[PDB]
mmCIF file of C-alpha atoms and ligand atoms in Angstrom:
data_model
loop_
_atom_site.group_PDB
_atom_site.id
_atom_site.type_symbol
_atom_site.label_atom_id
_atom_site.label_comp_id
_atom_site.label_asym_id
_atom_site.label_seq_id
_atom_site.Cartn_x
_atom_site.Cartn_y
_atom_site.Cartn_z
ATOM 1 C CA UNK A 1 23.200 -4.964 -0.763
ATOM 2 C CA UNK A 2 21.326 -2.345 -2.949
ATOM 3 C CA UNK A 3 19.415 0.485 -1.254
ATOM 4 C CA UNK A 4 17.795 3.083 -3.554
ATOM 5 C CA UNK A 5 15.533 5.740 -3.074
ATOM 6 C CA UNK A 6 13.594 8.236 -6.213
ATOM 7 C CA UNK A 7 12.339 10.964 -4.182
ATOM 8 C CA UNK A 8 9.967 14.503 -5.159
ATOM 9 C CA UNK A 9 12.717 16.406 -2.581
ATOM 10 C CA UNK A 10 15.186 19.051 -4.512
ATOM 11 C CA UNK A 11 18.259 18.243 -4.513
ATOM 12 C CA UNK A 12 19.192 21.401 -2.603
ATOM 13 C CA UNK A 13 17.440 19.202 0.175
ATOM 14 C CA UNK A 14 19.799 16.246 0.199
ATOM 15 C CA UNK A 15 22.573 17.597 2.725
ATOM 16 C CA UNK A 16 25.890 16.433 2.644
ATOM 17 C CA UNK A 17 27.272 13.129 3.628
ATOM 18 C CA UNK A 18 23.278 11.177 3.271
ATOM 19 C CA UNK A 19 24.537 8.436 0.070
ATOM 20 C CA UNK A 20 27.268 7.386 3.536
ATOM 21 C CA UNK A 21 24.985 8.291 6.163
ATOM 22 C CA UNK A 22 22.844 5.361 4.190
ATOM 23 C CA UNK A 23 25.819 3.485 3.322
ATOM 24 C CA UNK A 24 26.729 2.786 7.078
ATOM 25 C CA UNK A 25 24.186 2.623 8.666
ATOM 26 C CA UNK A 26 22.841 0.252 5.935
ATOM 27 C CA UNK A 27 26.356 -1.534 6.982
ATOM 28 C CA UNK A 28 25.666 -1.986 10.775
ATOM 29 C CA UNK A 29 21.619 -3.490 9.906
ATOM 30 C CA UNK A 30 22.607 -5.951 7.528
ATOM 31 C CA UNK A 31 25.557 -6.805 8.666
ATOM 32 C CA UNK A 32 27.826 -6.958 5.438
ATOM 33 C CA UNK A 33 30.763 -5.257 4.699
ATOM 34 C CA UNK A 34 30.792 -2.315 3.917
ATOM 35 C CA UNK A 35 32.634 -2.143 0.287
ATOM 36 C CA UNK A 36 29.495 -4.369 -0.839
ATOM 37 C CA UNK A 37 26.320 -1.996 0.255
ATOM 38 C CA UNK A 38 25.421 0.326 -3.100
ATOM 39 C CA UNK A 39 23.495 4.057 -2.460
ATOM 40 C CA UNK A 40 21.839 5.772 -5.762
ATOM 41 C CA UNK A 41 19.368 9.258 -4.393
ATOM 42 C CA UNK A 42 17.141 10.308 -7.028
ATOM 43 C CA UNK A 43 16.084 13.485 -5.667
ATOM 44 C CA UNK A 44 13.437 15.573 -7.710
ATOM 45 C CA UNK A 45 11.421 12.975 -8.921
ATOM 46 C CA UNK A 46 7.450 13.440 -10.346
ATOM 47 C CA UNK A 47 5.760 11.233 -7.799
ATOM 48 C CA UNK A 48 2.668 11.522 -5.403
ATOM 49 C CA UNK A 49 1.681 9.163 -2.654
ATOM 50 C CA UNK A 50 -1.985 8.761 -2.300
ATOM 51 C CA UNK A 51 -2.969 11.309 -4.941
ATOM 52 C CA UNK A 52 -1.096 14.687 -3.080
ATOM 53 C CA UNK A 53 2.603 15.565 -3.656
ATOM 54 C CA UNK A 54 4.052 16.248 -0.100
ATOM 55 C CA UNK A 55 7.510 15.105 0.257
ATOM 56 C CA UNK A 56 7.609 11.243 -0.061
ATOM 57 C CA UNK A 57 10.030 8.770 -0.868
ATOM 58 C CA UNK A 58 9.906 5.067 -3.270
ATOM 59 C CA UNK A 59 12.736 3.248 -1.606
ATOM 60 C CA UNK A 60 14.087 -0.615 -2.364
ATOM 61 C CA UNK A 61 16.114 -2.759 -0.191
ATOM 62 C CA UNK A 62 17.989 -5.674 -2.320
ATOM 63 C CA UNK A 63 20.176 -8.400 -0.453
ATOM 64 C CA UNK A 64 20.821 -11.533 -0.646
ATOM 65 C CA UNK A 65 19.907 -12.700 2.462
ATOM 66 C CA UNK A 66 19.347 -10.644 6.058
ATOM 67 C CA UNK A 67 15.577 -9.962 4.382
ATOM 68 C CA UNK A 68 12.581 -11.306 6.600
ATOM 69 C CA UNK A 69 9.776 -10.327 9.002
ATOM 70 C CA UNK A 70 11.640 -9.079 11.760
ATOM 71 C CA UNK A 71 14.472 -8.073 10.144
ATOM 72 C CA UNK A 72 12.841 -5.653 7.253
ATOM 73 C CA UNK A 73 11.003 -4.139 10.827
ATOM 74 C CA UNK A 74 13.275 -3.287 11.815
ATOM 75 C CA UNK A 75 14.835 -1.875 8.903
ATOM 76 C CA UNK A 76 12.172 0.422 7.829
ATOM 77 C CA UNK A 77 12.808 1.625 11.524
ATOM 78 C CA UNK A 78 15.755 2.901 10.885
ATOM 79 C CA UNK A 79 15.253 4.260 7.337
ATOM 80 C CA UNK A 80 12.399 5.806 7.697
ATOM 81 C CA UNK A 81 14.253 7.161 10.337
ATOM 82 C CA UNK A 82 16.903 8.797 8.618
ATOM 83 C CA UNK A 83 14.467 10.101 5.570
ATOM 84 C CA UNK A 84 12.828 11.484 8.429
ATOM 85 C CA UNK A 85 15.638 13.515 9.467
ATOM 86 C CA UNK A 86 17.631 14.189 6.748
ATOM 87 C CA UNK A 87 14.650 14.475 3.597
ATOM 88 C CA UNK A 88 12.011 15.596 5.595
ATOM 89 C CA UNK A 89 9.807 12.820 4.110
ATOM 90 C CA UNK A 90 6.592 11.503 6.917
ATOM 91 C CA UNK A 91 7.371 8.276 7.353
ATOM 92 C CA UNK A 92 3.621 7.736 6.236
ATOM 93 C CA UNK A 93 4.546 8.861 3.367
ATOM 94 C CA UNK A 94 7.254 6.092 2.688
ATOM 95 C CA UNK A 95 7.183 2.011 0.865
ATOM 96 C CA UNK A 96 10.323 0.629 1.057
ATOM 97 C CA UNK A 97 10.122 -3.185 -0.901
ATOM 98 C CA UNK A 98 12.310 -5.788 0.000
ATOM 99 C CA UNK A 99 13.751 -7.857 -1.945
ATOM 100 C CA UNK A 100 16.238 -11.480 -1.484
ATOM 101 C CA UNK A 101 17.808 -12.348 -3.679
ATOM 102 C CA UNK A 102 19.219 -15.814 -4.344
ATOM 103 C CA UNK A 103 22.983 -15.461 -5.265
ATOM 104 C CA UNK A 104 22.400 -17.072 -8.491
ATOM 105 C CA UNK A 105 20.033 -14.142 -9.556
ATOM 106 C CA UNK A 106 22.727 -11.348 -8.831
ATOM 107 C CA UNK A 107 25.685 -9.981 -10.864
ATOM 108 C CA UNK A 108 29.020 -8.425 -10.371
ATOM 109 C CA UNK A 109 32.356 -8.394 -11.290
ATOM 110 C CA UNK A 110 31.987 -10.248 -14.530
ATOM 111 C CA UNK A 111 30.494 -13.028 -12.844
ATOM 112 C CA UNK A 112 27.398 -14.209 -10.419
ATOM 113 C CA UNK A 113 27.979 -14.702 -5.970
ATOM 114 C CA UNK A 114 26.255 -17.647 -6.875
ATOM 115 C CA UNK B 1 0.138 0.004 -4.162
ATOM 116 C CA UNK B 2 3.218 1.101 -6.515
ATOM 117 C CA UNK B 3 3.016 2.220 -9.900
ATOM 118 C CA UNK B 4 6.425 3.319 -11.616
ATOM 119 C CA UNK B 5 6.272 4.319 -15.469
ATOM 120 C CA UNK B 6 10.478 5.286 -17.165
ATOM 121 C CA UNK B 7 8.943 6.692 -20.690
ATOM 122 C CA UNK B 8 10.973 8.941 -23.219
ATOM 123 C CA UNK B 9 8.871 11.533 -23.800
ATOM 124 C CA UNK B 10 9.637 14.889 -22.458
ATOM 125 C CA UNK B 11 8.041 16.305 -18.992
ATOM 126 C CA UNK B 12 6.337 18.905 -21.215
ATOM 127 C CA UNK B 13 3.708 16.159 -22.827
ATOM 128 C CA UNK B 14 2.635 14.575 -19.592
ATOM 129 C CA UNK B 15 0.046 16.539 -18.470
ATOM 130 C CA UNK B 16 -1.373 17.801 -15.878
ATOM 131 C CA UNK B 17 -3.117 15.975 -13.034
ATOM 132 C CA UNK B 18 -1.445 12.257 -15.369
ATOM 133 C CA UNK B 19 -0.527 11.469 -11.585
ATOM 134 C CA UNK B 20 -3.904 12.501 -9.480
ATOM 135 C CA UNK B 21 -5.665 10.342 -13.073
ATOM 136 C CA UNK B 22 -3.100 7.236 -12.284
ATOM 137 C CA UNK B 23 -3.641 7.668 -8.499
ATOM 138 C CA UNK B 24 -7.909 7.598 -8.720
ATOM 139 C CA UNK B 25 -7.521 4.831 -11.595
ATOM 140 C CA UNK B 26 -5.817 1.653 -9.786
ATOM 141 C CA UNK B 27 -7.236 2.413 -6.815
ATOM 142 C CA UNK B 28 -10.411 1.449 -9.017
ATOM 143 C CA UNK B 29 -8.996 -1.239 -10.455
ATOM 144 C CA UNK B 30 -7.097 -2.730 -7.530
ATOM 145 C CA UNK B 31 -9.916 -2.123 -5.482
ATOM 146 C CA UNK B 32 -7.543 -0.296 -3.303
ATOM 147 C CA UNK B 33 -7.803 2.618 -1.128
ATOM 148 C CA UNK B 34 -6.575 5.506 -3.456
ATOM 149 C CA UNK B 35 -3.958 7.392 -0.175
ATOM 150 C CA UNK B 36 -2.596 3.431 -0.343
ATOM 151 C CA UNK B 37 -1.721 4.581 -4.204
ATOM 152 C CA UNK B 38 1.722 5.914 -5.116
ATOM 153 C CA UNK B 39 2.701 6.942 -8.123
ATOM 154 C CA UNK B 40 6.038 8.159 -9.970
ATOM 155 C CA UNK B 41 6.668 9.636 -14.488
ATOM 156 C CA UNK B 42 9.471 9.390 -15.511
ATOM 157 C CA UNK B 43 9.986 11.484 -18.190
ATOM 158 C CA UNK B 44 12.924 11.874 -20.855
ATOM 159 C CA UNK B 45 14.440 8.802 -20.675
ATOM 160 C CA UNK B 46 16.998 7.738 -22.311
ATOM 161 C CA UNK B 47 15.856 4.450 -24.104
ATOM 162 C CA UNK B 48 15.209 2.106 -26.813
ATOM 163 C CA UNK B 49 12.251 -0.827 -27.877
ATOM 164 C CA UNK B 50 12.895 -2.848 -30.161
ATOM 165 C CA UNK B 51 15.913 -0.259 -31.454
ATOM 166 C CA UNK B 52 14.069 2.249 -31.934
ATOM 167 C CA UNK B 53 13.460 5.117 -30.202
ATOM 168 C CA UNK B 54 10.730 5.981 -31.031
ATOM 169 C CA UNK B 55 7.671 6.873 -27.417
ATOM 170 C CA UNK B 56 7.624 4.162 -25.582
ATOM 171 C CA UNK B 57 7.722 3.108 -21.433
ATOM 172 C CA UNK B 58 8.794 0.642 -19.462
ATOM 173 C CA UNK B 59 6.590 0.694 -16.318
ATOM 174 C CA UNK B 60 5.577 -1.627 -12.959
ATOM 175 C CA UNK B 61 2.801 -1.877 -10.445
ATOM 176 C CA UNK B 62 3.758 -4.185 -7.256
ATOM 177 C CA UNK B 63 0.335 -4.661 -4.869
ATOM 178 C CA UNK B 64 -0.162 -6.391 -2.027
ATOM 179 C CA UNK B 65 -2.265 -9.295 -3.714
ATOM 180 C CA UNK B 66 -3.964 -7.652 -6.748
ATOM 181 C CA UNK B 67 -2.435 -9.226 -8.420
ATOM 182 C CA UNK B 68 -2.500 -12.831 -11.341
ATOM 183 C CA UNK B 69 -3.136 -13.621 -14.434
ATOM 184 C CA UNK B 70 -6.391 -11.916 -15.328
ATOM 185 C CA UNK B 71 -6.107 -9.467 -13.241
ATOM 186 C CA UNK B 72 -3.145 -8.000 -14.765
ATOM 187 C CA UNK B 73 -4.278 -8.625 -18.652
ATOM 188 C CA UNK B 74 -6.738 -5.857 -17.297
ATOM 189 C CA UNK B 75 -4.210 -3.485 -15.683
ATOM 190 C CA UNK B 76 -2.647 -3.754 -19.042
ATOM 191 C CA UNK B 77 -4.807 -2.976 -21.439
ATOM 192 C CA UNK B 78 -6.493 0.219 -18.424
ATOM 193 C CA UNK B 79 -2.639 1.613 -18.632
ATOM 194 C CA UNK B 80 -1.988 0.918 -21.846
ATOM 195 C CA UNK B 81 -5.352 2.784 -22.425
ATOM 196 C CA UNK B 82 -3.991 5.915 -20.689
ATOM 197 C CA UNK B 83 -0.414 5.762 -22.018
ATOM 198 C CA UNK B 84 -1.609 5.697 -26.032
ATOM 199 C CA UNK B 85 -4.311 8.425 -24.608
ATOM 200 C CA UNK B 86 -2.205 11.062 -22.345
ATOM 201 C CA UNK B 87 0.668 10.449 -23.439
ATOM 202 C CA UNK B 88 0.672 9.418 -27.245
ATOM 203 C CA UNK B 89 3.039 5.777 -26.175
ATOM 204 C CA UNK B 90 1.671 2.450 -28.660
ATOM 205 C CA UNK B 91 0.841 -0.027 -26.210
ATOM 206 C CA UNK B 92 3.338 -2.202 -28.401
ATOM 207 C CA UNK B 93 6.258 0.157 -27.327
ATOM 208 C CA UNK B 94 5.103 -0.598 -23.503
ATOM 209 C CA UNK B 95 6.272 -2.741 -21.248
ATOM 210 C CA UNK B 96 4.401 -3.247 -18.059
ATOM 211 C CA UNK B 97 5.713 -5.989 -14.695
ATOM 212 C CA UNK B 98 3.951 -6.947 -11.774
ATOM 213 C CA UNK B 99 5.102 -7.682 -8.891
ATOM 214 C CA UNK B 100 3.184 -9.703 -6.175
ATOM 215 C CA UNK B 101 4.474 -8.581 -2.831
ATOM 216 C CA UNK B 102 4.235 -10.716 0.210
ATOM 217 C CA UNK B 103 3.462 -7.549 2.843
ATOM 218 C CA UNK B 104 6.904 -8.416 5.459
ATOM 219 C CA UNK B 105 8.023 -7.581 1.998
ATOM 220 C CA UNK B 106 7.278 -3.570 1.699
ATOM 221 C CA UNK B 107 8.243 -1.157 4.590
ATOM 222 C CA UNK B 108 6.265 1.801 5.090
ATOM 223 C CA UNK B 109 5.251 4.116 8.223
ATOM 224 C CA UNK B 110 8.386 3.003 10.429
ATOM 225 C CA UNK B 111 7.831 -1.083 10.468
ATOM 226 C CA UNK B 112 6.104 -3.053 7.279
ATOM 227 C CA UNK B 113 2.084 -4.293 5.930
ATOM 228 C CA UNK B 114 3.301 -8.042 7.430
ATOM 229 C CA UNK C 1 14.534 -9.167 -21.688
ATOM 230 C CA UNK C 2 14.477 -5.557 -20.799
ATOM 231 C CA UNK C 3 18.039 -4.294 -20.035
ATOM 232 C CA UNK C 4 18.402 -0.643 -17.718
ATOM 233 C CA UNK C 5 21.586 0.372 -15.901
ATOM 234 C CA UNK C 6 21.575 3.409 -13.617
ATOM 235 C CA UNK C 7 25.232 5.699 -13.375
ATOM 236 C CA UNK C 8 26.533 8.029 -11.877
ATOM 237 C CA UNK C 9 29.237 8.050 -15.446
ATOM 238 C CA UNK C 10 27.785 11.125 -16.826
ATOM 239 C CA UNK C 11 25.311 11.243 -20.041
ATOM 240 C CA UNK C 12 28.179 12.818 -22.415
ATOM 241 C CA UNK C 13 29.844 10.005 -21.213
ATOM 242 C CA UNK C 14 27.493 7.102 -22.729
ATOM 243 C CA UNK C 15 29.347 6.594 -25.760
ATOM 244 C CA UNK C 16 27.207 6.990 -29.129
ATOM 245 C CA UNK C 17 25.403 3.737 -30.139
ATOM 246 C CA UNK C 18 25.626 2.502 -27.042
ATOM 247 C CA UNK C 19 21.951 1.407 -26.545
ATOM 248 C CA UNK C 20 21.918 0.036 -29.573
ATOM 249 C CA UNK C 21 24.331 -2.079 -28.833
ATOM 250 C CA UNK C 22 23.241 -3.701 -25.738
ATOM 251 C CA UNK C 23 20.304 -4.181 -27.716
ATOM 252 C CA UNK C 24 21.617 -5.854 -30.074
ATOM 253 C CA UNK C 25 24.426 -7.997 -27.824
ATOM 254 C CA UNK C 26 21.169 -8.766 -25.675
ATOM 255 C CA UNK C 27 20.070 -10.300 -28.731
ATOM 256 C CA UNK C 28 22.919 -12.315 -29.367
ATOM 257 C CA UNK C 29 23.085 -13.037 -25.611
ATOM 258 C CA UNK C 30 19.769 -14.400 -25.038
ATOM 259 C CA UNK C 31 18.368 -15.092 -28.983
ATOM 260 C CA UNK C 32 14.942 -13.240 -28.635
ATOM 261 C CA UNK C 33 14.123 -11.141 -31.256
ATOM 262 C CA UNK C 34 16.282 -7.477 -31.366
ATOM 263 C CA UNK C 35 13.108 -6.529 -32.295
ATOM 264 C CA UNK C 36 11.639 -6.985 -28.474
ATOM 265 C CA UNK C 37 14.452 -5.795 -26.574
ATOM 266 C CA UNK C 38 14.183 -2.944 -24.505
ATOM 267 C CA UNK C 39 17.952 -1.138 -23.468
ATOM 268 C CA UNK C 40 17.490 2.398 -20.617
ATOM 269 C CA UNK C 41 20.358 4.084 -19.665
ATOM 270 C CA UNK C 42 20.019 6.158 -16.510
ATOM 271 C CA UNK C 43 23.109 9.198 -16.334
ATOM 272 C CA UNK C 44 24.041 11.129 -13.877
ATOM 273 C CA UNK C 45 22.978 9.645 -10.653
ATOM 274 C CA UNK C 46 23.808 10.327 -6.801
ATOM 275 C CA UNK C 47 25.583 6.815 -6.488
ATOM 276 C CA UNK C 48 27.910 5.355 -4.492
ATOM 277 C CA UNK C 49 29.334 1.890 -4.310
ATOM 278 C CA UNK C 50 31.454 0.791 -0.887
ATOM 279 C CA UNK C 51 30.971 4.374 -0.086
ATOM 280 C CA UNK C 52 33.093 6.255 -3.251
ATOM 281 C CA UNK C 53 31.964 7.269 -5.725
ATOM 282 C CA UNK C 54 33.737 6.478 -8.152
ATOM 283 C CA UNK C 55 31.628 5.256 -11.638
ATOM 284 C CA UNK C 56 29.239 2.754 -10.478
ATOM 285 C CA UNK C 57 26.688 1.314 -11.544
ATOM 286 C CA UNK C 58 23.174 -0.429 -10.724
ATOM 287 C CA UNK C 59 21.429 -2.583 -13.107
ATOM 288 C CA UNK C 60 18.808 -4.816 -14.542
ATOM 289 C CA UNK C 61 17.566 -7.450 -16.660
ATOM 290 C CA UNK C 62 14.475 -9.079 -16.415
ATOM 291 C CA UNK C 63 13.421 -11.895 -18.682
ATOM 292 C CA UNK C 64 11.312 -14.666 -19.344
ATOM 293 C CA UNK C 65 12.702 -17.788 -18.903
ATOM 294 C CA UNK C 66 16.357 -17.140 -20.071
ATOM 295 C CA UNK C 67 17.699 -16.337 -16.363
ATOM 296 C CA UNK C 68 19.534 -19.097 -14.644
ATOM 297 C CA UNK C 69 22.828 -20.092 -13.319
ATOM 298 C CA UNK C 70 25.435 -19.979 -16.359
ATOM 299 C CA UNK C 71 23.013 -18.191 -18.167
ATOM 300 C CA UNK C 72 22.966 -14.951 -15.694
ATOM 301 C CA UNK C 73 27.300 -15.612 -15.267
ATOM 302 C CA UNK C 74 27.713 -15.492 -19.021
ATOM 303 C CA UNK C 75 24.977 -12.503 -19.092
ATOM 304 C CA UNK C 76 27.041 -10.564 -16.645
ATOM 305 C CA UNK C 77 31.015 -11.348 -18.500
ATOM 306 C CA UNK C 78 28.971 -9.337 -21.321
ATOM 307 C CA UNK C 79 27.188 -5.699 -19.594
ATOM 308 C CA UNK C 80 30.263 -5.236 -17.113
ATOM 309 C CA UNK C 81 32.616 -6.403 -20.120
ATOM 310 C CA UNK C 82 30.257 -2.977 -22.232
ATOM 311 C CA UNK C 83 30.221 -1.476 -19.192
ATOM 312 C CA UNK C 84 33.846 -1.683 -18.849
ATOM 313 C CA UNK C 85 34.572 -0.920 -23.053
ATOM 314 C CA UNK C 86 32.201 1.661 -23.259
ATOM 315 C CA UNK C 87 31.861 3.370 -20.347
ATOM 316 C CA UNK C 88 34.862 2.964 -18.164
ATOM 317 C CA UNK C 89 33.244 1.863 -15.123
ATOM 318 C CA UNK C 90 35.420 -1.385 -13.011
ATOM 319 C CA UNK C 91 33.446 -4.445 -13.067
ATOM 320 C CA UNK C 92 33.925 -4.981 -9.183
ATOM 321 C CA UNK C 93 31.839 -1.678 -9.226
ATOM 322 C CA UNK C 94 28.844 -3.250 -10.715
ATOM 323 C CA UNK C 95 25.777 -4.455 -9.767
ATOM 324 C CA UNK C 96 23.907 -6.562 -11.890
ATOM 325 C CA UNK C 97 19.863 -7.853 -10.681
ATOM 326 C CA UNK C 98 18.640 -10.829 -12.352
ATOM 327 C CA UNK C 99 14.475 -11.385 -13.191
ATOM 328 C CA UNK C 100 13.006 -14.768 -14.790
ATOM 329 C CA UNK C 101 9.390 -12.672 -14.670
ATOM 330 C CA UNK C 102 6.051 -15.291 -15.413
ATOM 331 C CA UNK C 103 4.970 -14.728 -18.288
ATOM 332 C CA UNK C 104 1.226 -13.266 -16.539
ATOM 333 C CA UNK C 105 3.472 -11.450 -14.650
ATOM 334 C CA UNK C 106 4.338 -9.173 -18.176
ATOM 335 C CA UNK C 107 2.420 -5.901 -19.591
ATOM 336 C CA UNK C 108 2.757 -5.848 -23.549
ATOM 337 C CA UNK C 109 0.110 -4.582 -25.857
ATOM 338 C CA UNK C 110 -2.530 -4.221 -23.789
ATOM 339 C CA UNK C 111 -2.127 -8.051 -22.484
ATOM 340 C CA UNK C 112 0.549 -9.911 -20.990
ATOM 341 C CA UNK C 113 2.502 -12.975 -22.366
ATOM 342 C CA UNK C 114 0.446 -15.238 -21.316
HETATM 343 C C1 HWR D 1 6.807 -12.644 -30.528
HETATM 344 C C2 HWR D 1 5.423 -13.247 -29.776
HETATM 345 O O1 HWR D 1 5.420 -14.663 -28.957
HETATM 346 C C3 HWR D 1 4.889 -14.401 -28.006
HETATM 347 O O2 HWR D 1 5.273 -13.856 -26.273
HETATM 348 C C4 HWR D 1 6.023 -15.290 -25.833
HETATM 349 C C5 HWR D 1 6.930 -14.568 -25.123
HETATM 350 O O3 HWR D 1 7.604 -13.398 -26.806
HETATM 351 C C6 HWR D 1 8.902 -12.257 -26.338
HETATM 352 C C7 HWR D 1 9.570 -12.187 -27.000
HETATM 353 C C8 HWR D 1 11.173 -10.868 -26.594
HETATM 354 O O4 HWR D 1 11.779 -11.440 -27.489
HETATM 355 C C9 HWR D 1 10.818 -10.046 -25.886
HETATM 356 C C10 HWR D 1 9.204 -10.489 -25.194
HETATM 357 C C11 HWR D 1 8.921 -11.386 -24.833
HETATM 358 O O5 HWR D 1 9.406 -9.652 -23.180
HETATM 359 C C12 HWR D 1 10.126 -8.533 -23.371
HETATM 360 C C13 HWR D 1 10.555 -9.036 -21.140
HETATM 361 C C14 HWR D 1 11.175 -9.848 -20.274
HETATM 362 C C15 HWR D 1 10.685 -9.222 -19.442
HETATM 363 C C16 HWR D 1 10.185 -8.351 -18.766
HETATM 364 O O6 HWR D 1 10.038 -8.596 -17.366
HETATM 365 C C17 HWR D 1 9.313 -7.416 -19.419
HETATM 366 C C18 HWR D 1 9.659 -6.967 -20.770
HETATM 367 C C19 HWR D 1 11.596 -9.371 -23.400
HETATM 368 C C20 HWR D 1 11.595 -9.479 -25.287
HETATM 369 O O7 HWR D 1 12.925 -9.006 -25.732
HETATM 370 O O8 HWR D 1 8.268 -14.979 -25.228
HETATM 371 C C21 HWR D 1 7.623 -15.767 -24.133
HETATM 372 C C22 HWR D 1 9.202 -15.994 -23.630
HETATM 373 O O9 HWR D 1 9.698 -16.674 -24.443
HETATM 374 C C23 HWR D 1 6.520 -15.820 -24.059
HETATM 375 O O10 HWR D 1 6.431 -17.268 -23.845
HETATM 376 C C24 HWR D 1 5.443 -15.830 -25.322
HETATM 377 O O11 HWR D 1 5.066 -17.000 -25.650
HETATM 378 C C25 HWR D 1 3.306 -13.870 -28.212
HETATM 379 O O12 HWR D 1 2.488 -14.474 -29.177
HETATM 380 C C26 HWR D 1 3.176 -12.537 -28.148
HETATM 381 O O13 HWR D 1 2.238 -12.185 -28.379
HETATM 382 C C27 HWR D 1 4.472 -12.175 -29.575
HETATM 383 O O14 HWR D 1 5.501 -10.590 -29.741
HETATM 384 CL CL1 CL D 2 23.715 -8.481 -1.299
HETATM 385 CL CL1 CL D 3 15.969 -13.769 -6.787
HETATM 386 CL CL1 CL D 4 0.363 -2.709 -1.482
HETATM 387 CL CL1 CL D 5 -6.651 -12.854 -11.744
HETATM 388 CL CL1 CL D 6 7.638 -10.358 -2.232
HETATM 389 CL CL1 CL D 7 13.071 -12.208 -22.350
HETATM 390 CL CL1 CL D 8 7.260 -12.894 -11.687
#
C-alpha cells in the first residue's frame, strides 16, 4: 500500500519517527506486511481547507484490497488520530481519499502485482 | 471536494488570494459549501508538457458527485480560465483529472462521508 | 499519458535530459503523440518504502485507454528500468499506480477529451 500526506504544516513540525509510525500503524491496520508499505509526507504546502489556512492535510491511501466502508472508517480514525497528535492538525481539516487498486494496475519490481 | 494544481510557474507568480478565489469559484461551480472545498497549489515543479517546459499544469478535482460529462466541460472552462488569467498558463498546456468519489472512500473528521 | 514520479533522490541526482527521455520513451511505449505527453518529477521527498529511506519512488501513469494487464507490465519494465539506470532506484522500491481514465474525466484546453 501507499500512504501520502500533503500538509501546510512546516517541515520542522514533523516529529522524528513520523514516517516509521505511519509505516508500522498502516501495516497493522491493513494487515499487509510492512515491507510493502510506502509512506510519503509533504510539508510546507500552499493549501487551504474551507478557505482558511490553519493546519490541514490532504491524504490518500492506495491498497490492493483492504479498502471498504468499515475499514475506511477505521483507517480514518487511526490516521486523523496520528495527524492530530503528531502534526496538531484538527481531524475536521483532513481529507483522505481511499483507493482499492486492482493488482494489474499496481506496478512494482519490473512487473505488476497481477 | 479537493482541487490540486501542480505547475512549473514560480511561487512568486501565484497571486495573493488565489487559494481563496479557487475556493469560492469551486464552491459556486460544484454547488458544495465552501467549508468543504480544499485547494492545494504546488508551484516550482519540474515538469514538461509535450517536451516543453513552458508554463503548464497538471491538476485534479475530486468530488463526491457533481462530476460528469457536461459538468466536467464546464469545470475545465472555469479552471483553465483561472489558470490562464492568474498564472499565465495556456489552456492547451493544462490537464485536469476528474474523480467522482464514493462517499465511503473519502475520509474526514475521524470517519468517512458514508 | 501523463507520468508523475515522486522520489527521495535529490534534485542534483536527476540527470540532465530525464524529462525528455521519459516523454520520448512513453511516446514509444504507448504510440501516443509526444506533443501531448506530460511528465512531472518530484525529487527531495520525505518518503520511506518498507520502513527504509533508501532511494525509492512512488509514481502514477494516467492514460485514456492503453491501460491493461500486459500493457502495464510492459510500462513497469520500461519505467523501472529508467528509474534504475538514471536515478539508481532499485525496481523493488518503486510503485507505479496505473489509471485508465474515461475521456469525459480528463480536462484539457477549456473542455474535455469526450
Ligand atoms: C489529438 C486530438 O485527439 C482528440 O482527443 C483524443 C485524445 O487525444 C489524446 C492524445 C494524447 O497524446 C494524450 C491525451 C489524449 O490524453 C493525455 C492524458 C491522459 C490521461 C490523463 O489523465 C490526462 C491526460 C495523455 C496524452 O498523451 O485521445 C483519446 C484516447 O485515445 C480520446 O478519445 C480523444 O479522441 C481530440 O480531437 C483532441 O482535441 C485532439 O488534441
Ligand atoms: Cl497494496
Ligand atoms: Cl484500479
Ligand atoms: Cl466532496
Ligand atoms: Cl454532467
Ligand atoms: Cl471512489
Ligand atoms: Cl494516453
Ligand atoms: Cl475515469
